[PDB]
């Protein structure tokens, strides 16, 4: 409640937009369409581990790009689940949909995936102090990771008082603009409520 969003801070400097198009009059309903698309692709695909969704709209033609560590699940029974999802998107928009799953190289140095895995362990009742440490070690064993910070906050294991601990390895210069800091946020749905999990991954300054 005091730190700025790391992505928003550098948006337009280092990080880039996840939606690309130009629309003067058709801006509001493009936004309304994209939010519905994002609800759809967030529902049911949690097992698939979605990293980030990028949306491309090119003069009445929509190109949706999804990134995950396990494209086999999103495709399904060799092109059946993918076809069903594309049919859902077609029914949603009315415009012909081009759906693409590419790959996620390293779901160990990728925030919003590290965070999702940690939240999965919390939901499965693993000790948080162990899940956080294993995630941090897995991330620091990656090619280009100059540091990582992982923060969990909530009732943290059935406690009554909610608290917040965080661990840190390497260096994570949040205030620096020339940095390349990936951000990830996910919530674990434990039996006692929700638990927020935040991950900051620093991957060196710039190209």
């Amino acid at each position: 409640g005091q730190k700025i969003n790391p992505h928003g801070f550098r948006l337009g400097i280092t990080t880039d937009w996840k939606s690309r198009w130009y629309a003067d009059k058709q801006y509001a309903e493009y936004v309304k369409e994209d939010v519905a698309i994002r609800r759809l692709l967030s529902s049911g695909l949690e097992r698939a581990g979605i990293a980030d969704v990028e949306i491309e709209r090119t003069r009445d033609r929509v190109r949706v790009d999804i990134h995950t560590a396990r494209p086999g699940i999103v495709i399904g029974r060799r092109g059946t689940e993918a076809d069903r999802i594309r049919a859902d998107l077609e029914k949603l928009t009315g415009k012909q949909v081009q759906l693409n799953i590419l790959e996620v190289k390293n779901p160990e140095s990728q925030a919003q995936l590290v965070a999702q895995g940690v939240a999965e362990q919390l939901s499965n009742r693993v000790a948080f102090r162990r899940a956080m440490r294993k995630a941090i070690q897995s991330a620091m064993r990656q090619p280009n990771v100059k540091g990582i910070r992982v923060q969990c906050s909530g009732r943290l294991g059935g406690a009554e008082m909610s608290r917040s601990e965080f661990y840190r390895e390497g260096r994570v210069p949040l205030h620096t603009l020339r940095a390349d800091i990936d951000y990830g946020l996910y919530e674990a749905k434990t039996t006692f409520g929700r638990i927020g999990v935040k991950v900051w991954i620093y991957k060196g300054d710039i190209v």
Binding site: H7, L11, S19, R20, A28, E29, V31, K32
Partner: protein, 60 residues
């Protein structure tokens, strides 16, 4: 907001002057921008996430 109110707003009301805008994402009735159709909150989170092309923090 309540789903009954969200459906009522989405519908076509009697006396077209009665039509009002709600947030396209959360259903907030107040502080909804016409160009996005979002409330100020949902606008802020979407802009930080980068899901709104052309929008970015402003310094001058």
């Amino acid at each position: 907001a309540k789903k009954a109110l969200v459906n009522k707003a989405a519908g076509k009301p009697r006396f077209a002057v009665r039509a009002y805008t709600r947030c396209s994402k959360c259903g907030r009735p107040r502080a909804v921008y016409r160009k996005f159709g979002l409330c100020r909150i949902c606008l802020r989170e979407m802009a930080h996430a980068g899901e709104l092309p052309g929008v970015q923090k402003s310094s001058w």
